Amino acid sequence: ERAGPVTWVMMIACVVVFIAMQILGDQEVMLWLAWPFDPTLKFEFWRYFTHALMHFSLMHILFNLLWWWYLGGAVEKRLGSGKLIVITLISALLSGYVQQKFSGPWFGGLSGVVYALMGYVWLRGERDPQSGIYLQRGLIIFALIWIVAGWFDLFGMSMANGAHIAGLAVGLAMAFVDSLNA
């Protein structure tokens, strides 16, 4: 097995939520989990994070969880459960913030966090051959194409571009901070 607790609970949580959305409908689940979309929702703290848990298409959940399982799982095994927790909380909160800024609160997906993990695993392999956390050359290629497809909207349901940029930024910023060690 190569799923730590944290890699695993996140996969589970995303699956459960995705089931909820097929059963109750997307809007119904958004209503409960979306970034605050009204002044009356601002103290509902779970919302600054739980938008990460919602997926809108089968290809969305599947690609997000494939990358999570892999990079997230690499990060947990080599660097520990708490590092992945903090990349995750920070990426989710910060991507959510920039996404709603540009485009308002109706958005969801783990891909702000996947982008943080991509940028993080890459830049920390490059400035620290010693976690050994690294992003394998073939996988930098598959990651770049992924990045590109979002930016130029190559998927055919439209994309949380704020959340993507913010996500990657946070992952770079943290790899930077982390590698600047010994």
Binding site: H60, F107, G108
Partner: peptide, 4 residues
């Protein structure tokens, strides 16, 4: 909606 927008997908992240």
């Amino acid at each position: 909606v927008r997908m992240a």
